[PDB]
Every structure is written in C-alpha cells, then in structure tokens.
Amino acid sequence: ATDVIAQRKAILKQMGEATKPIAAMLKGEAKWDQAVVQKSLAAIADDSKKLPALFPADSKTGGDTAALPKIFEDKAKFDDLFAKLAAAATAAQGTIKDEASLKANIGGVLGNCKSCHDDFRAK
Ligand code: HEC
C-alpha cells in the first residue's frame, strides 16, 4: 500500500479544476469553447473511473483526509456514485455541443458532486 489519500486528493483537485472553465462559461465570464468543455468532461469521466480504487478501509484512520467513515458502511453506494458521475460526464460529451446545450445539460453532471459530498465528505 501507498499514500492513496494523497493520490485521490490530487485527482479530486484536478476534477475541481476541470469544472472551473465550465463555471466561467456559465457565468458569462469566458466565451463558449467546445474543445475546453469536452476536455473537462473527459477529465471528470476518467477521474471518476480511477477514484473507486483509492478508498481502502485501512486508510479510514489516515489523518489528512476529508473522507468520512460513512463511506465504509455504504461502500457500494459510494462506488456507484462515482460510476454515475462517470456515466453522466460521458453522456454529456455527446449531449453538450453548444452553449445552449451546456446550459440545459450541465446540471445533471455537476449535481453528482454535491450528492456525494453531502454524505461522504467533511463539511
Ligand atoms: C463521491 C462519489 C464523490 C464524487 C461523486 C465527487 N467527490 Fe469530490 N470528494 C469526495 C471525497 C470523499 C472527498 C475528500 C477526499 C479526501 O480524501 O480528502 C472529495 C474531495 C474533493 C475535492 C478536494 C480535493 C483536495 O484537494 O483535497 C475537490 C476539489 C472535489 N472533491 C471536487 C469534486 C467535483 C468538482 C466533483 C464533481 C464533478 C466531485 N468532487 C465529485 C467524494 C466525491
């Protein structure tokens, strides 16, 4: 075993950064860029496929993590929420093709972030 807590925080930090250009477009502070959006959705999908392998029970007493112990009492649900986000971002690469579809469809993707945080991340 190795520092999976450091690994997973690095990947989730990247996920956070991938949402930044999308938020900027939604705010009207950055112009629509289909390539940038595709890049962010692809990162979100790839990160979500990697994260399921980085939350071992032997790291529940890790010390520098915001992961809640609840994760290990509902692991199937936790794992599947990442699969849900991976599938949402993957579907969004096909459904988000212009600014209008970004505004109509991005919520389905981003809502998964809060859904998991409310149950499994420290506040
Ligand atoms: C559970 C299925 C999750 C999903 C879906 C998403 N996140 Fe999350 N995230 C989760 C946990 C358990 C944690 C704590 C990790 C730890 O070990 O401390 C996080 C953390 C983050 C972070 C902070 C990373 C850091 O630098 O320490 C960010 C920026 C973050 N998460 C972003 C984020 C986004 C943008 C998501 C949706 C696209 C998202 N997370 C989903 C659990 C889960």
Swiss-Prot record:
Source species: Rhodopseudomonas palustris (strain ATCC BAA-98 / CGA009)
Name of the gene this protein is made from: cycA
Transmembrane segments: none
Name this polypeptide is given: Cytochrome c'
One example of a Gene Ontology biological process annotation: electron transport chain
Keyword Aminoacyl-tRNA synthetase appears in the UniProt entry: no
Its job: Cytochrome c' is the most widely occurring bacterial c-type cytochrome. Cytochromes c' are high-spin proteins and the heme has no sixth ligand. Their exact function is not known.
GO MF, one example: iron ion binding
Post-translational modification: Binds 1 heme c group covalently per subunit.
Keyword Signal annotated: yes
Portion held of the full protein: 22 to 144 of 146
Binding annotation for heme c: 8, 65-66, 113, 116-117
Subunit structure: Monomer.
Keywords: Electron transport, Heme, Iron, Metal-binding, Signal, Transport
